[PDB]
Coordinates of C-alpha atoms and ligand atoms in Angstrom, one line a residue:
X1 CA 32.1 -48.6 180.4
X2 CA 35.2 -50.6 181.8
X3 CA 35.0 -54.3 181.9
X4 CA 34.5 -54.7 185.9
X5 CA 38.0 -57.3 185.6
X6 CA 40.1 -54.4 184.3
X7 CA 38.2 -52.2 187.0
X8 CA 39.7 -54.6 189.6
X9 CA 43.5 -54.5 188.0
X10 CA 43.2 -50.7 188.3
X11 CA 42.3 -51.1 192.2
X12 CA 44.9 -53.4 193.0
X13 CA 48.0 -51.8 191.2
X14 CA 51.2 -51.9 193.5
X15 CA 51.0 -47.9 194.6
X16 CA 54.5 -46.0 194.2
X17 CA 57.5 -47.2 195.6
X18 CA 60.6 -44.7 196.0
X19 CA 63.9 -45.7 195.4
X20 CA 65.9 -44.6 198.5
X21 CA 68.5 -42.7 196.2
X22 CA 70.2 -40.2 197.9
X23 CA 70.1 -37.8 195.4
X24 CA 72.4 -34.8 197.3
X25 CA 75.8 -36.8 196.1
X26 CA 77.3 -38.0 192.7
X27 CA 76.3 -40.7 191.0
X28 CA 78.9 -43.5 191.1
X29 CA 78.2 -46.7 189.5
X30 CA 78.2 -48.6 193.0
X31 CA 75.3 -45.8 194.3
X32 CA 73.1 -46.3 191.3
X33 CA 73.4 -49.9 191.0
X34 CA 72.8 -50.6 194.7
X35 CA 69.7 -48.5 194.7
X36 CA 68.1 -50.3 191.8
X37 CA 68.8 -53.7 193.4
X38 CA 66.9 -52.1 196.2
X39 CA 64.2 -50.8 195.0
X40 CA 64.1 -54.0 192.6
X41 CA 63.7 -55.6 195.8
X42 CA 60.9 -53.3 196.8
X43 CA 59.1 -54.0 193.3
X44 CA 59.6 -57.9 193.8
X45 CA 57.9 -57.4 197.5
X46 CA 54.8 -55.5 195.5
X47 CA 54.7 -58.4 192.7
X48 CA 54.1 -61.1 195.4
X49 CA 51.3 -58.6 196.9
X50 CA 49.4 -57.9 194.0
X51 CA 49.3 -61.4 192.9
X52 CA 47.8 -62.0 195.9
X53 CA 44.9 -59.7 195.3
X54 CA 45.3 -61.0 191.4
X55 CA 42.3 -62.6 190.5
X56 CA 42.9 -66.6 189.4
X57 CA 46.3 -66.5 190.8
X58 CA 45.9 -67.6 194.6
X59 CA 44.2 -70.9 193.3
X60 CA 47.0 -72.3 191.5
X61 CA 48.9 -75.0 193.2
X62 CA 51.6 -72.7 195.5
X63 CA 54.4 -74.0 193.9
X64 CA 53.0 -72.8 190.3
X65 CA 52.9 -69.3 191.9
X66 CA 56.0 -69.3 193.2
X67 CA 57.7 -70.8 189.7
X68 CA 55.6 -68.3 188.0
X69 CA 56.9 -65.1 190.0
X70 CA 60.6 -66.5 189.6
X71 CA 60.3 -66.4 185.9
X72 CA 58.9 -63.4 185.2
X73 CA 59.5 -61.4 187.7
X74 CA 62.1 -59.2 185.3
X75 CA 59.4 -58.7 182.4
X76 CA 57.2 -57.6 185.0
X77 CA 59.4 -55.1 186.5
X78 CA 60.8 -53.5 183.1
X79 CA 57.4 -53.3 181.7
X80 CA 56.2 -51.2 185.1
X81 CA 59.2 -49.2 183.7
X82 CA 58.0 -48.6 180.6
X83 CA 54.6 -47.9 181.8
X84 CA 55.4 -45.4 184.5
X85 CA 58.4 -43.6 182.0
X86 CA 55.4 -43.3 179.8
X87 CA 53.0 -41.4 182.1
X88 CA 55.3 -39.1 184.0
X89 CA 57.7 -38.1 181.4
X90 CA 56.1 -38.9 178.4
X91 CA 58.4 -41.8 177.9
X92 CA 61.7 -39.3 177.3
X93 CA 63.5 -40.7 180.9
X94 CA 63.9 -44.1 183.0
X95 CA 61.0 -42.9 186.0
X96 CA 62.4 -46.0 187.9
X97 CA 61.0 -44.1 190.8
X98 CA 60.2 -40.0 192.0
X99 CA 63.6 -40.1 193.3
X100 CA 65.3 -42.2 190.9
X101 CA 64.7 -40.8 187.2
X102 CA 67.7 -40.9 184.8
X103 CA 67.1 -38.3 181.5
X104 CA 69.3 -39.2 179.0
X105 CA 72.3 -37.4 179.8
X106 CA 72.3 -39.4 183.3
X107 CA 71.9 -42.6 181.2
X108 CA 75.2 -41.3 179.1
X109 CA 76.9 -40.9 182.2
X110 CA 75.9 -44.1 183.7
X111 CA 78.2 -47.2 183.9
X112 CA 75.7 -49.1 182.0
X113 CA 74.4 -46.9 178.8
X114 CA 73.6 -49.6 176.5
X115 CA 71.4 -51.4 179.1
X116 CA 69.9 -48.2 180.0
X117 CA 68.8 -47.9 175.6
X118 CA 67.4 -51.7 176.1
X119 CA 65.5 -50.6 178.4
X120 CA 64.4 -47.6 177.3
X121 CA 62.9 -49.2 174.0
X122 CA 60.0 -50.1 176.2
X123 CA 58.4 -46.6 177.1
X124 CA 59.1 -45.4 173.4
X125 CA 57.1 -49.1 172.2
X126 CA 54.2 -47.5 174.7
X127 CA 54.4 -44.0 172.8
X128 CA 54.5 -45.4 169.4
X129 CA 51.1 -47.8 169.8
X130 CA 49.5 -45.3 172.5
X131 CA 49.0 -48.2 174.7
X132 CA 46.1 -47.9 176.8
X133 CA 46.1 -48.1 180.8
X134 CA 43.5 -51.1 180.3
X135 CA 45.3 -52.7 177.6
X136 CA 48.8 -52.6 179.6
X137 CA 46.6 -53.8 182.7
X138 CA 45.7 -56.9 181.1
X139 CA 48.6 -57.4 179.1
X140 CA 50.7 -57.1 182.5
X141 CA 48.9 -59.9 184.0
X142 CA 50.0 -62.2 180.4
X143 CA 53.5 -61.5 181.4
X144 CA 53.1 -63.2 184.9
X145 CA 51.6 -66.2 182.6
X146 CA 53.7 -66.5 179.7
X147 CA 56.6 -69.0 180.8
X148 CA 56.1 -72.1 182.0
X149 CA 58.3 -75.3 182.9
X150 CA 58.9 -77.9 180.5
X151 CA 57.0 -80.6 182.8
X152 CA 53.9 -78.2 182.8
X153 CA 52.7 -76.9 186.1
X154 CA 50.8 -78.6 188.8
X155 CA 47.7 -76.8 188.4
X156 CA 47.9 -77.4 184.3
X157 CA 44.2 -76.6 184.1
X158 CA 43.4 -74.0 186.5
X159 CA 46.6 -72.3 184.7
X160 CA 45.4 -72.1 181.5
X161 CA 41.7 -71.3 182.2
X162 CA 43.5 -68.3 183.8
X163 CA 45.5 -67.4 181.6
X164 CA 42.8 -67.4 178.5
X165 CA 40.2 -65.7 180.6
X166 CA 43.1 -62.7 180.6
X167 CA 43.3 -62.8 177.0
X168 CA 39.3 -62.7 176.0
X169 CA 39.7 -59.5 178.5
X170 CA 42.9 -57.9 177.0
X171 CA 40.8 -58.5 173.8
X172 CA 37.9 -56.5 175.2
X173 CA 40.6 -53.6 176.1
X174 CA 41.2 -53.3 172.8
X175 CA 37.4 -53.2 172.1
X176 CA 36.9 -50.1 174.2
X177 CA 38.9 -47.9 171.6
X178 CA 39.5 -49.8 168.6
X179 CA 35.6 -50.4 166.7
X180 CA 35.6 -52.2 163.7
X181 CA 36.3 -55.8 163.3
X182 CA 39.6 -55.6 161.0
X183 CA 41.5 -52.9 163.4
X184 CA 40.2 -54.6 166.7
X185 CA 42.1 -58.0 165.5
X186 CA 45.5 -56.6 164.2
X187 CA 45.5 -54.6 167.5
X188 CA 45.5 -58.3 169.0
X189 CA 48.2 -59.0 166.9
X190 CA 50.5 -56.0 167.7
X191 CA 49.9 -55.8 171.1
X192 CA 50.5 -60.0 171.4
X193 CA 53.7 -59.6 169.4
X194 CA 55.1 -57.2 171.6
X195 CA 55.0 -59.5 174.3
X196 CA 56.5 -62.2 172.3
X197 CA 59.0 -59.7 171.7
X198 CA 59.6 -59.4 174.9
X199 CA 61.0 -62.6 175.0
X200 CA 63.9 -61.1 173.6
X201 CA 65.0 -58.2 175.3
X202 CA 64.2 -59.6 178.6
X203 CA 66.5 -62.1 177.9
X204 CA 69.5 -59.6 177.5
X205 CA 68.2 -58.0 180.6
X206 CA 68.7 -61.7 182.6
X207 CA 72.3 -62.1 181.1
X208 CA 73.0 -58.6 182.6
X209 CA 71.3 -59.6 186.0
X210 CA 73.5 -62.9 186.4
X211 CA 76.9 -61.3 185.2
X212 CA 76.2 -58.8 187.7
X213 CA 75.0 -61.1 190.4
X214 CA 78.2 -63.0 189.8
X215 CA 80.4 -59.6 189.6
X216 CA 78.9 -58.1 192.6
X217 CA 82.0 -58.1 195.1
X218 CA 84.1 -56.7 192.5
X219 CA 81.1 -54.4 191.5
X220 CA 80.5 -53.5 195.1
X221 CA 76.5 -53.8 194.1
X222 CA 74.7 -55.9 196.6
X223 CA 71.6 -57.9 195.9
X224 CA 69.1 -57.7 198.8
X225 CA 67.3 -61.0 199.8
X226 CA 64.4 -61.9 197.6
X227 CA 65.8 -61.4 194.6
X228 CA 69.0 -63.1 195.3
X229 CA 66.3 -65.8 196.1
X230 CA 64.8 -66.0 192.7
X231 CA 67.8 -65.5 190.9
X232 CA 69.8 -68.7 192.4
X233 CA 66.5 -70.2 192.3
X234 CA 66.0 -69.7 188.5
X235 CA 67.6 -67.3 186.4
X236 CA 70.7 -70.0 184.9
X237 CA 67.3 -72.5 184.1
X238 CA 65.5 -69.4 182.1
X239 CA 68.9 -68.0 180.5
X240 CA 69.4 -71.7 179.2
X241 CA 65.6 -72.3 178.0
X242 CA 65.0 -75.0 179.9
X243 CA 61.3 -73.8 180.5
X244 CA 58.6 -73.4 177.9
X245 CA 57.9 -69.4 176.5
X246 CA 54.3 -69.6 175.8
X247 CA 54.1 -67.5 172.3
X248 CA 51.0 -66.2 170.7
X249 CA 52.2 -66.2 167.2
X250 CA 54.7 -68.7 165.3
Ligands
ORB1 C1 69.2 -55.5 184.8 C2 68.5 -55.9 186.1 N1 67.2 -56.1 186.2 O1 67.0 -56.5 187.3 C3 68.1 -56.7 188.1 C4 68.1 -57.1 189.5 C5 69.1 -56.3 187.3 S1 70.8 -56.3 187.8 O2 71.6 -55.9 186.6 O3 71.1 -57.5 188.5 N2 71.0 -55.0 188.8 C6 70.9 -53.6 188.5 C7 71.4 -52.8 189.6 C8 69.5 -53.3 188.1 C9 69.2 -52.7 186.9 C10 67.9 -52.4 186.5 C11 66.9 -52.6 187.4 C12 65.5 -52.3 187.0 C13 65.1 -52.7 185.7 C14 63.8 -52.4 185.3 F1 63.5 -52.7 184.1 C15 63.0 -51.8 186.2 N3 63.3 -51.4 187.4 C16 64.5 -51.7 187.9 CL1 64.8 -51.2 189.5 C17 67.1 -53.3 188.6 C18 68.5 -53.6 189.0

């Protein structure tokens, strides 16, 4: 049966969010744009809710959670990407929501192809290891947990108690499909190393964000509230590594 923990990340996932895209009209780079900073404003609102209901989460220090959400806010969001993409459309479009899905052809006529193909490795990553709902549960929750600042957090203890009580139950994810001892732990290690790989293209992802954010007059793209919030309050820190990745493997 499923571990009761994952039960309770299944309960508490953000329900769907449309886009607002007006669909009727043309895309124009300006459209697009400004609908995903809108309903990546949406998603940031959903974040903050769920880790509310997030077990562990509400008894770190408020600052931690705050931090926390500022830095990983983007892996969050492109991984629900890659998780819904996967689902809906067997990983073959950008489901960024039921009014805002971008086939191929849509991406080649975008204003921003080679971020759409980043992003896109992420839903084919999901088709090639056959991720399960409980593993990508568990290893969601890891992402919220897996940068921290340089000085540590307040609630040092409580945060890592947390965080290693999510990875014994990613690790019994694994154990619902994967019997036998030798494929149980090298499904640890892909699954791990795909978040450390994350790292990575998350990284090109925030060098887009802030040479948009800085373009956006010019761009005529405007960034709703929240997340020109956790952009000024972060994003030049994280782009510079000035805060600590947390890595499972050297
Ligand atoms: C890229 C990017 N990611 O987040 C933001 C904000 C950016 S951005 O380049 O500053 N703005 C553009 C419009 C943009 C592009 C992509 C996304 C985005 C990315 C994602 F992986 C999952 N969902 C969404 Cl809505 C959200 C906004």
């Amino acid at each position: 049966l499923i571990p009761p923990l994952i039960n309770l990340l299944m309960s508490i996932e953000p329900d769907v969010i449309y886009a607002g895209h007006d669909n009727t009209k043309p895309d124009t780079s300006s459209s697009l744009l400004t609908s995903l900073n809108q309903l990546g404003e949406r998603q940031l609102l959903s974040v903050v809710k769920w880790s509310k209901s997030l077990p562990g989460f509400r008894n770190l220090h408020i600052d931690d959670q705050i931090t926390l959400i500022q830095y990983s806010w983007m892996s969050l969001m492109v991984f629900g990407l890659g998780w819904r993409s996967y689902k809906h459309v067997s990983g073959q479009m950008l489901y960024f929501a039921p009014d805002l899905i971008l086939n191929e052809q849509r991406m080649k006529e975008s204003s921003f192809y080679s971020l759409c193909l980043t992003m896109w490795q992420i839903p084919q990553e999901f088709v090639k290891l056959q991720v399960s709902q409980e593993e990508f549960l568990c290893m969601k929750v890891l992402l919220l947990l897996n940068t921290i600042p340089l000085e540590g957090l307040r609630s040092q203890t409580q945060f890592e108690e947390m965080r290693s009580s999510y990875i014994r139950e990613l690790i019994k994810a694994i154990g619902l499909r994967q019997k036998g001892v030798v494929s149980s732990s090298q499904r640890f290690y892909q699954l791990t190393k795909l978040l450390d790989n994350l790292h990575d293209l998350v990284k090109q992802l925030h060098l887009y964000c802030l040479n948009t954010f800085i373009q956006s007059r010019a761009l005529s793209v405007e960034f709703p509230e929240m997340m020109s919030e956790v952009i000024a309050a972060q994003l030049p820190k994280i782009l510079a590594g000035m805060v600590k990745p947390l890595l499972f493997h050297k």
